[PDB]
């Protein structure tokens, strides 16, 4: 029933392949993004609760190394910041401001690393949402002109050789419109949820940096 | 080309102009993309190596082993530390005053790094906006020619005006080429370049903090 | 020629609501531009009248008689200063809390002032956000009626459905009428709102700082 | 080549479009010229400062050319003038003077900006509204010709296209005006932002050094 490529010029086939697998890539990105975002979300409340669940400062670090490499999110931020904190503290590191700023350094850099490595493939969604109808319009208008120039070779409104051109026009515009929906479905919701992730990661940042501040002025 | 040839020279002229923009745009995309991607990971390599339990003067002499071929955060470090030591030399600015000149040196080096990495980028924005409008500029003129021609002939109902507006619509088609890659490249390279800008910026702040600490201890 | 007493008496209503939206938006542009210009004019005037170097008490004495006639920064200063003097007279157990009390009085005064200051802009944001959609719906309805009419005429002659399609094209053309002016005014005047509230913001923190230093010296 | 045949409304549209187009080109020429100029003087001034020149010497030099003190250096002049004015009024505090100084620098900043871009918003809105003006021209032409189409019915095969072209030339000239505006808009905006960042850094470091060392003097 999908007799598309059998009767297809080079350009229509080009745009169709440029858009179909592109859309399936758009859904694959949806699946991966929602999976990782939900996984991080469920970890967020649990870890934040365990922050003040009676686990003293050192104990969380001592138990963190069990999953040292397979560590992510706020817990990974904790691991990096606190391990470099104790690295500095085991040395002289006499200046409290020095250790505090090193803590801020490590926390914010690890928080960034998590923010980007979780936040991937996202602007591609906006790009496709922008240019998918425009590519369809290209295919359609080229189909229009390709048949309209040929129309100037006959006299009567034959309408028999134009039908392939009409099919090309409809196919181009339809496939161009096809990818528009999932693009915007991804972009806004994913961006807002990632912004919430950034918000509570920042919360963790200033919170545990204040904790480390008070700890450094405590020891 | 077979059906492209129109008597109006403006059509050929503007199509060649757009094709030239097509060449420039794609060349800029691939070249700036490769250069920017190559320069990207060097920043994180420096970030890892810098604080991997090393001494600042060791990194400075290492950079002095890599003179006059220096790019990225290594250049920022070299400029900042050479400015620091030269302004920290005997009978010079106060310990709290050298850091301002050092910050200026690192910052102007950082700016230079931006534009010499961000060289051809705004051309993408310039071309992307104008290209469809140029395509319409062509097609309206072609339609004017075709319609004044149609004004005199009798009958020939839709059997002669075909090229007069088909080779006008091609102007819009070529304008539509010229818009697509340019805008996406402009965007994505803007976010990547601003990411690098933020990296270098923060690095400047904590490096100024480190220099203040050194001046306190030196 | 009106070319208006020809449609199905629904697209006509669409055109009426569209032209009414355009007129209302235009009136809003006039009114809000006028009041924004007046506020901008008063801004720098209060700026230099405040920081001419006169005492705070003298400035408040100049005020307190124009209370209901105050507007913008005048009202902000009056409300905050009134709360400041009230709390200082009453509490007398606020070594450093009167500053936050005055800050919150200033802040709530600012919140109500800005609630007053950009009242009608979201109407422009909405009308600019909706014009092309409703216009496209209107022309869709028009062409729908036109094609529903053509279901009995033999040969499917198309030249006789000309008025319906022509007025549908007018409907989409007039449908896009308020789209561009509305959004243009929206953006342009929102920029002015942003800069003015930034002026109010820097006003806010230097006022808070000077009150912080000066409040506890009495 | 149909200006005289154009209706009064079409006359008005084409006239405003061509006027705004010529205004756009004039804006591009003059404003980019002064932009490049101010860039050169800003770079020269930045080179001059931190050259071992005492602040009083630079202030005296600015007094020498105060009338023609165009560029970034009027920020420095206004800042030093405010600083000395506040210092004469010795009834002040270490952090009281710097606040007023920063206010003086930022109001001088806004002065320099509002001089620096005047017609750039005009470019933005003309680029935004040009195709809408073309829409006005086309719709008026189409309805005016459709009146004649309804006046006589013979299917009017041939004597329509000239009117369509005379309506479409409105959009042609409108977008022709749009082209220079849209190319120049962001081109000048990014330069303006660059200069804004330069001035912001200048103000920041100037207040820093004034608060740190110039407090004694």
């Amino acid at each position: 029933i999908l007799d598309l490529f059998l009767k297809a010029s080079l350009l229509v086939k080009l745009i169709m392949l440029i858009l179909i697998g592109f859309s399936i890539a758009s859904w694959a990105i949806i699946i991966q993004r929602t999976r990782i975002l939900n996984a991080a979300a469920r970890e967020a409340e649990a870890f934040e609760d365990k922050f003040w669940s009676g686990i003293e400062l050192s104990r969380l670090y001592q138990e963190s190394q069990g999953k040292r490499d397979n560590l992510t999110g706020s817990e990974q931020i904790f691991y990096s910041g606190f391990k470099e904190f104790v690295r500095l503290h085991r040395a002289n590191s006499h200046a409290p401001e020095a250790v505090v700023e090193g803590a801020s350094r490590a926390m914010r850099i690890s928080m960034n690393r998590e923010l980007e490595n979780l936040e991937t493939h996202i602007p591609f969604l906006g790009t496709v949402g922008s240019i998918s109808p425009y590519i369809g319009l290209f295919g359609t208008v080229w189909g229009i002109m390709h048949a309209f120039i040929a129309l100037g070779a006959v006299k009567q409104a034959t309408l028999q050789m134009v039908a392939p051109g009409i099919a090309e026009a409809l196919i181009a515009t339809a496939i161009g419109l096809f990818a528009a929906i999932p693009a915007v479905m991804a972009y806004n919701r994913l961006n807002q949820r990632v912004n919430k992730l950034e918000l509570n990661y920042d919360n963790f940042m200033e919170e545990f940096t204040a904790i480390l501040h008070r700890q450094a002025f405590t020891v | 080309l077979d059906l492209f040839l129109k008597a109006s020279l403006l059509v050929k002229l503007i199509m060649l102009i757009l094709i030239g923009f097509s060449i420039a745009s794609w060349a800029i995309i691939i070249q700036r993309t490769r250069i920017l991607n190559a320069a990207a990971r060097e920043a994180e390599a420096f970030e890892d190596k810098f604080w991997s339990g090393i001494e600042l003067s060791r990194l400075y002499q290492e950079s002095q082993g890599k003179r006059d071929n220096l790019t990225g955060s290594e250049q920022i470090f070299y400029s900042g530390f050479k400015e620091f030591v030269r302004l920290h030399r005997a009978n010079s600015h106060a310990p709290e005053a050298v850091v301002e000149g050092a910050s200026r040196a690192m910052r102007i080096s950082m700016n230079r790094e931006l534009e010499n990495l961000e060289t051809h980028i705004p051309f993408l924005g310039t071309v992307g906006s104008i290209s469809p409008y140029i395509g319409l500029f062509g097609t309206v003129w072609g339609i004017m020619h075709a319609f004044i021609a149609l004004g005199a002939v009798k009958q020939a109902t839709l059997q002669m005006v075909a090229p007069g507006i088909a080779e006008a619509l091609i102007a819009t088609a070529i304008g539509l080429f010229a818009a697509i890659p340019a805008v996406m490249a402009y965007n994505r390279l803007n976010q990547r370049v601003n990411k690098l800008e933020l990296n270098y910026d923060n690095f400047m702040e904590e490096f100024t903090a480190i220099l203040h600490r050194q001046a306190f201890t030196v | 020629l009106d070319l208006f007493l020809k449609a199905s008496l629904l697209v006509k209503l669409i055109m009426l609501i569209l032209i009414g939206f355009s007129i209302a938006s235009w009136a809003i542009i006039i009114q809000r531009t006028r009041i924004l210009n007046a506020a901008a004019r008063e801004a720098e005037a209060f700026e230099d009248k405040f920081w001419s170097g006169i005492e705070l008490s003298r400035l408040y004495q100049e005020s307190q008689g124009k209370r209901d006639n105050l507007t913008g920064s005048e009202q902000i200063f009056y409300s905050g200063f009134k709360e400041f003097v009230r709390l200082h007279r009453a509490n007398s157990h606020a070594p450093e809390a009167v500053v936050e009390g005055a800050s919150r009085a200033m802040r709530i005064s600012m919140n109500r002032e800005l609630e007053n200051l950009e009242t009608h802009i979201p109407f422009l944001g909405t009308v600019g956000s909706i014009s092309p959609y409703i216009g496209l719906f209107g022309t869709v309805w028009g062409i729908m009626h036109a094609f529903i009419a053509l279901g009995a005429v033999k040969q499917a002659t198309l030249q006789m459905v000309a008025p319906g399609i022509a007025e549908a094209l007018i409907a989409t053309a007039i449908g896009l009428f308020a789209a561009i002016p509305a959004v243009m005014a929206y953006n342009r005047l929102n920029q002015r709102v942003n800069k003015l509230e930034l002026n109010y913001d820097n006003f806010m923190e230097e006022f808070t700082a000077i009150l912080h230093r000066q409040a506890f010296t009495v | 080549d149909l200006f005289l045949k154009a209706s009064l409304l079409v006359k008005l549209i084409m006239l405003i479009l061509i006027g705004f187009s010529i205004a756009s080109w004039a804006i591009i020429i003059q404003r980019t010229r002064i932009l490049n100029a101010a860039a050169r003087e800003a770079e020269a001034f930045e080179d001059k400062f931190w050259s071992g020149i005492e602040l009083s010497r630079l202030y005296q030099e600015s007094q020498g050319k105060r009338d023609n003190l165009t560029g970034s250096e009027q920020i420095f002049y206004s800042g030093f003038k405010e600083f000395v004015r506040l210092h004469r009024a010795n009834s002040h505090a270490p952090e009281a003077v710097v606040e007023g100084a920063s206010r003086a620098m930022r109001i001088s900043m806004n002065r320099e900006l509002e001089n620096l871009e005047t017609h750039i918003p005009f470019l933005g809105t003309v680029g935004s509204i040009s195709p809408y003006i073309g829409l006005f021209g086309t719709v008026w032409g189409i309805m005016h010709a459709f009146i004649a189409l309804g006046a006589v019915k013979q299917a009017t095969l041939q004597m329509v296209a000239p009117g369509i072209a005379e309506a479409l030339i409105a959009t042609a000239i409108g977008l022709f005006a749009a082209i220079p505006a849209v190319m120049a808009y962001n081109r000048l905006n990014q330069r303006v932002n660059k200069l804004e960042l330069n001035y912001d850094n200048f103000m920041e470091e100037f207040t820093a050094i004034l608060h740190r060392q110039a407090f004694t003097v």
């Binding site: - | 906006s129 339609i143 839709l158 005006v161 819009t172 805008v183 | 000309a162 053309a173 | 829409l135 189409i142």
Partner: peptide
């Protein structure tokens, strides 16, 4: 930063009106 083709509707109208005659 964004592609703007809104003048093209005028071409749409011009192409459309040339048939009904």
């Amino acid at each position: 930063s964004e592609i703007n083709i809104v003048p093209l509707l005028d071409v749409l109208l011009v192409l459309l009106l040339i048939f009904m005659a």
